[PDB]
Design a protein around this ligand. Structure first.
Ligand SMILES: Nc1ncnc2c1ncn2[C@@H]1O[C@H](COP(=O)(O)OP(=O)(O)O)[C@@H](O)[C@H]1O
Lengths: 132, 48, 373, 256, 191, 195, 100
């Protein structure tokens, strides 16, 4: 229940994955999870992020396939560098810096799973020239 | 919004004319069996 | 098979030891090492006089073991096929070898080369052009096998004495010289090969550069002891040196295949004697007056028009041709060997450009300290 | 077979980070993986990268290992999330290329027929080159030369990925690598253009000097074919300035 | 439970397609591969067996996996026309099996040799010393005609099983026919 | 022979790619379980320099999906009421069209139950039209193998109360096939081209 | 001989590989397509006025491969769904559909 002026050390390649994934699925509201680790309470660092195809159902917890996520994590462990899951990201063309009802529900499920599971809003269409 | 339904397939799918002029087909909500819903009856739809 | 081994142990001194090895190899069911033994016996210091008998024995062994190495078997038995020396049945022999080994390995393409070689030796009209073209048409997805490539290069080099290919024949002969590096054959015959390639370049028309043979040591050292006037003439064609006396001595030095085309030699050397000015002077002397042309080519005034016309056609000089002052503008788009021993000239010009660029960069920096400092 | 390749400003930093993260325990200096992307119109582009731990031995350069099952699973996942992405080539660090590259190319070309090699200089930033592209051509070295490997460099240019301009502007936000301050910025443009021209042409002069000394093998068969025309092209004739004495000097004097 | 991770490097030399065994020595060695992989699967179906090649290449596609069908498919039509590179083959087998695997999983490299080899004694002794320093556990099984259990192979095995090692034997097979059960009888439960 | 390795690759490639079919299909099918836009196909046969489509959405918009990215135009002809992606703006799948308000069910009886036994008097005529209509339904393959295409147009003329309606419905019941009744006198509509 | 059933297995593999390539083209596309508009005004060589069939008109760019001679004024074109730029131009048809 302690949340100070926390700061996210997000990585440039994580940004590039975000913009590429959003640019691909602009109208699908594609989903993903932000691969970060709580090195301490508030100095959260994210070095990598992955892109996952939103299932036809839409924004659902089962759309992020558990077996597929586990296999992806194992692949990252074998080749690359392992990293924990304490966050998520989502291209949000509909409206701005808030979450929809289903987004709040799935973030509540992520919060139950993880410790924080930060809710990150990234708008792919509003970011055009200078403001992401 | 609530709109009438048009018709359905053999059982699962429902081809519906909606007051938003939409060619609307949905999986009927799990709490609602297809038996209760009949052609030409008004049903509300959850925007999500 | 034991009976054939017993019969085959005869007909040669030292053969029964190899036949015992052959017996051991098929007892333990060895095919590749058997092909090596067949290779050793065929390349043994003997003429293989019993060509038909050894053909029958080898076919006997291969048909009752039916698991030998295909490409190397055909590479070896082709010696016996050629040695049998009867083209009417030799074609059937090559068809039989194709039927016994019809895989897409070196075997079939080697059989095609043997067919083409037979068609050269007799009947140079039946399938000669289709065979030679189809070798390259079938060397697809085969970048560096280099074995049948060398074979195809040899056939087409021997096809030089045919109307179809002269300059391409020289090109594939160069390809043979590259692909096979060691001498692997008498120096005198390589020197004869160098003589033929030199005559090919002299008689040819499209061979203006004709690279990898002008100053190539692998080609020149063969005739370094005999007919060095041929070496000098190729160097003349390379560097643009005229040496008209030596080049005329070249014309009647090797009389066959040169006396009829000595006029073509005249035109080519007049064509290629201007390149020396072309690369040495980077538009430093861009006034190719008639007197300068006369010094370069020892040619008359009316022939200048035809010479510069052919120069524009081939690609030596592409500049404007005047006649009030007879000035020829200098652009070259067909580079060739620049006598790497004389690379100091282009190195000096390049370092001159470096010094000029750096000096002007420093000068503009001196003029620009009021902003850059 | 491709005409040319174009590298995005999208995979270079990803490769460098992959080098950094897998170099913590693997100090082989040799990072080997695959670059994925798309090839559409004789222009090949790279959109994704992946690194695999990789160990080498100097003995004939034939000692190595990879995780091919994990790498293939990565490729399936990448194609599933984005179908247009495909393996365009495989990359190795250590610009001093060794001899295992031929074996790696032979093994990986089952994913890409025109297998290409990419070298990323994680630590080196020599002038501006982030990476170099390599095409495998073993179809006879030349017309009259012996057999060789001869991995040539297909021309590479840094592309312009979309939607990354926002991120790169926010990231840097300090240098402003744009034409801002037109006069001073173009002065800097002239400055490093002269710097690059002097450095590269000095390198060419050094290569000519070393060819003259003959300590290194001479690839003259393409060197003079490409540099003779360069030298003889008549950009030194000044009579066209005589014909164009007012080349723009009229515009110079109206601007004054 | 003590689980075993085995990496097999199989001799794809130019001679292996000969018919010394009934189908081919290549198929005989393939039959050696799938029976030992079957034994590993019967011990526990999640025992993992992987393929390594040494015919001037190192096949890694068939990784350290329990399934045997990928080994059978990928080793079939291996085109046994190239040469043998023993020093590279076992070493790359070491690196391939050095990859991510359980620490409980006992690392073991098994080699199949079926053709005569022309390599330097000094080079292979140097490799044996290097593997001795690296504490490598390799057992080698021969098949068919060869200078079977040559001086290089004997010294290589002696270095890898000596100094109170596992005790993995190398069998001196008769040229041509051989009894695969008698070849793999000792190391399947002892070594 | 090579069959062992061939079938080892064949079965795996079959099952894995059909699994990829299922994965693809599910990801589009839930979008096919959420179609929203009517498909007014302004068909343009744009051959790639094969086909294309112009779809008038229910929300009054036009989507030019390329080359009809999911469905074949042999079954998708220029018309309406075919599933269109709500998010991918693409033709999902065919669905039944609309049967012109009145014709949706004017008076269509799903199945008549009146029997041939309760009617009679004209048994020769009823047997004649049974041979001309019902037999081309049950024994349609008999006509097919014979080579004679049965006639279709049967006109029952006679004063009212002669049982034409019962006979027609009884014939339809015997055929066990669909029966559609048209109210002729009310087909005269003031609307232009309504009939 | 199990190898003589190779032909039947080949037929099965070819039959399904047709379905597999069909699905590959079905999923690899997964496209959103392009919105359809009309060239309301060419404006200039860079910016063009393209009006959607149902309201808004936008000042958009043109496809790189296409040229103004291929675009022309008053011709049906396709705009990018999100970035709102010309992607392709399409011919149009009208039909009286009565008594034809
Ligand atoms: N053969 C018959 N058997 C039984 N009922 C009949 C018969 N013919 C006519 N009907 C009666 O006539 C009615 C049908 O009338 P209608 O169809 O208008 O006659 P029509 O077909 O000659 O115009 C039915 O309600 C039925 O009871």
């Amino acid at each position: 229940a302690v949340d100070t002026a926390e700061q996210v050390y997000i990585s440039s390649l994580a940004l590039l994955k975000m913009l590429k994934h959003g640019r691909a699925g602009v109208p699908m509201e594609v989903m993903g999870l932000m691969l970060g680790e709580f090195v301490d309470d508030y100095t959260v660092r994210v070095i990598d992020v992955f892109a996952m195809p939103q299932s036809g159902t839409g924004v659902s917890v089962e759309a992020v396939d558990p077996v597929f996520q586990a296999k992806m994590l194992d692949m990252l462990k074998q080749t690359g560098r392992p990293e924990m899951v304490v966050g998520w990201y989502h291209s949000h063309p509909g409206f701005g810096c808030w979450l929809s009802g289903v987004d709040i529900n799935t973030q509540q499920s992520f919060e139950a799973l993880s410790e924080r599971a930060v809710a990150v809003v990234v708008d792919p269409i509003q970011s055009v020239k200078g403001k992401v | 919004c609530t709109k009438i339904i048009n018709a359905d397939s053999e059982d699962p799918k429902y081809i519906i004319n909606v007051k938003q002029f939409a060619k609307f087909v949905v999986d009927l909500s799990d709490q609602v069996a297809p038996t209760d819903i009949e052609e030409g009856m008004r049903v509300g739809v959850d925007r999500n | 098979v034991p009976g054939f081994l017993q019969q085959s142990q005869n007909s040669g001194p030292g053969q029964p030891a190899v036949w015992h090895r052959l017996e051991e190899l098929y007892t333990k069911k060895l095919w590749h090492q058997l092909t090596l033994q067949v290779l050793d016996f065929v390349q043994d210091p003997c003429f293989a006089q019993g060509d038909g008998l050894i053909k029958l024995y080898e076919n006997f062994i291969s048909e009752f073991e039916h698991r030998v190495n295909p490409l190397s078997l055909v590479e070896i038995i082709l010696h016996v096929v050629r040695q049998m020396t009867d083209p009417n049945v030799a074609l059937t022999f090559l068809e039989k070898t194709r039927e016994k080994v019809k895989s897409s390995d070196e075997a079939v393409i080697l059989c095609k080369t043997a067919i083409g070689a037979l068609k050269l030796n007799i009947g140079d009209l039946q399938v000669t052009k289709e065979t030679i073209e189809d070798v390259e048409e079938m060397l697809n997805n085969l970048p560096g096998v280099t074995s049948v490539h060398s074979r195809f290069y040899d056939l087409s080099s021997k096809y030089y004495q045919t109307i179809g290919n002269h300059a391409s024949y020289y090109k594939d002969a160069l390809r043979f010289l590259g692909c096979v590096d060691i001498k692997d054959l008498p120096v005198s015959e390589q020197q004869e090969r160098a003589f033929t390639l030199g005559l090919a370049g002299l008689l040819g028309e499209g061979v203006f550069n004709f690279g990898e043979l002008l100053m190539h040591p692998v080609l020149e050292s063969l005739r370094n002891t005999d007919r060095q006037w041929l070496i000098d003439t190729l160097y003349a064609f390379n560097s643009g040196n005229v040496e008209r006396f030596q080049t005329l001595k070249t014309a009647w030095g090797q009389q066959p295949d040169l006396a009829a085309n000595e006029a073509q030699l005249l035109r080519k050397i007049q064509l290629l004697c201007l390149m020396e000015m072309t690369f040495t002077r980077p538009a430093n002397h861009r006034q190719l007056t008639f007197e300068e042309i006369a010094k370069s080519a020892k040619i008359t005034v009316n022939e200048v028009e035809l010479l510069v016309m052919k120069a524009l056609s081939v690609g030596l000089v592409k500049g404007s041709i005047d006649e009030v002052d007879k000035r020829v503008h200098m652009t070259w788009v067909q580079p060739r060997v620049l006598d790497l021993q004389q690379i100091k000239g282009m190195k000096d010009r390049l370092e001159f450009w470096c010094t000029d660029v750096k000096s002007m960069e420093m000068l503009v920096e001196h003029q620009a300290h009021d902003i850059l400092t | 077979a491709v005409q040319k390749v174009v590298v995005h400003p999208l995979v270079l930093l990803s490769v460098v980070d992959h080098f950094n993260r897998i170099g913590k325990v693997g100090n082989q200096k040799r990072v080997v993986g695959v670059l994925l992307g798309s090839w559409q119109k004789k222009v090949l582009d790279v959109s994704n990268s992946f690194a695999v731990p990789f160990d080498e031995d100097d003995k004939d350069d034939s000692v190595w290992f990879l995780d091919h099952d994990y790498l293939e699973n990565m490729y399936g996942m990448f194609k599933k999330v984005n179908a247009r992405e495909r393996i365009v080539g495989w990359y190795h660090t250590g610009p001093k290329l060794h001899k295992n590259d031929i074996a790696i190319n032979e093994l990986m070309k089952r994913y890409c027929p025109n297998s290409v090699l990419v070298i990323i200089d994680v630590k080196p930033k020599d002038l501006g080159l982030p990476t170099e592209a390599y095409i495998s051509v073993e179809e006879v070295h030349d017309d009259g030369t012996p057999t060789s490997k001869t991995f040539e460099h297909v021309t590479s240019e840094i592309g312009a990925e979309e939607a990354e301009e926002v991120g790169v502007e926010h990231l840097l936000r300090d240098i402003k690598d744009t034409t801002v301050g037109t006069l001073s910025q173009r002065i800097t443009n002239q400055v490093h253009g002269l710097k690059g021209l002097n450095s590269k042409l000095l390198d060419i002069r050094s290569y000519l000097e070393k060819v003259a000394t003959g300590k290194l093998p001479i690839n003259h068969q393409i060197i003079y074919q490409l540099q003779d025309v360069f030298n003889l092209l008549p950009d030194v004739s000044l009579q066209e300035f005589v014909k164009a004495f007012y080349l723009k000097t009229n515009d110079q004097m109206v601007v004054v | 439970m003590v689980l075993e991770s085995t990496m097999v490097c199989v001799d794809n030399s130019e001679y292996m397609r000969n018919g010394d065994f009934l189908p081919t020595r290549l198929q005989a060695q393939q039959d050696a591969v799938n029976i030992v992989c079957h034994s590993k699967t019967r011990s526990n179906p999640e025992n993992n067996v992987g393929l390594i090649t040494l015919a001037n290449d190192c096949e890694v596609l068939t990784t350290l996996t329990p399934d045997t069908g990928r080994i059978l498919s990928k080793l079939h039509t291996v085109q046994p026309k190239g040469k043998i590179t023993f020093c590279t083959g076992i070493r790359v087998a070491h690196l391939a099996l050095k990859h991510r695997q359980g620490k409980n999983h006992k690392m073991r490299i098994i080699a199949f040799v079926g053709s005569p080899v022309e390599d330097n004694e000094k080079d292979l002794v140097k490799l044996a010393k290097r593997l001795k320093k690296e504490k490598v556990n390799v057992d080698i099984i021969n098949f068919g005609e060869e200078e079977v259990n040559t001086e290089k192979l004997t010294a290589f095995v002696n270095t890898l099983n000596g100094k109170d090692g596992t005790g993995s034997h190398l069998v001196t097979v008769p040229p041509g026919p051989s009894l695969a059960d008698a070849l793999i009888s000792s190391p399947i439960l002892a070594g | 022979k090579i069959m062992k390795s061939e079938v080892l690759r064949v079965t795996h490639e079959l099952q894995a790619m059909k699994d990829k079919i299922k994965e693809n299909s599910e990801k589009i099918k839930v979008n096919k379980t959420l179609p929203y836009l009517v498909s007014n196909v302004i068909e343009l046969l744009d051959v790639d320099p094969g086909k294309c489509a112009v779809i008038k959405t229910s929300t009054r918009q036009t989507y030019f999906l390329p080359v009809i990215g999911l469905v074949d135009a042999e079954k998708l002809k220029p018309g309406d009421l075919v599933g269109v992606n709500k998010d991918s703006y693409l033709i999902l799948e065919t669905l039944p069209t609309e049967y012109d308000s009145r014709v949706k069910a004017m008076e269509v009886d799903e199945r008549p139950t009146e029997q041939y036994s309760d009617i009679g008097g004209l048994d020769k005529q009823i047997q004649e039209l049974v041979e001309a209509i019902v037999l081309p339904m049950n024994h349609k393959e008999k006509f097919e193998n014979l080579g004679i295409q049965p006639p279709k147009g049967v006109l029952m003329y006679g004063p009212p109360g002669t049982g034409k309606t019962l006979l027609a419905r009884a014939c339809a019941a015997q055929t066990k096939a669909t029966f559609l009744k048209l109210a002729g006198p009310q087909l005269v509509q003031m609307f232009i081209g309504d009939g | 001989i199990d190898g003589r059933l190779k032909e039947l297995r080949e037929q099965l593999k070819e039959l399904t590989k047709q379905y597999e390539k069909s699905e590959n083209d079905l999923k690899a596309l997964q496209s959103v397509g392009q919105i359809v508009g009309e060239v309301l005004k060419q404006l200039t060589e860079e910016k063009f006025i393209v009006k959607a069939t149902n309201g808004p008109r936008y000042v958009v760019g043109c496809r790189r491969q296409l040229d103004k001679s291929k675009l022309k004024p008053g011709t049906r074109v396709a705009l990018d769904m999100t970035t709102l730029t010309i992607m392709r131009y399409l011919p149009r048809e009208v039909d009286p559909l009565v008594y034809n």
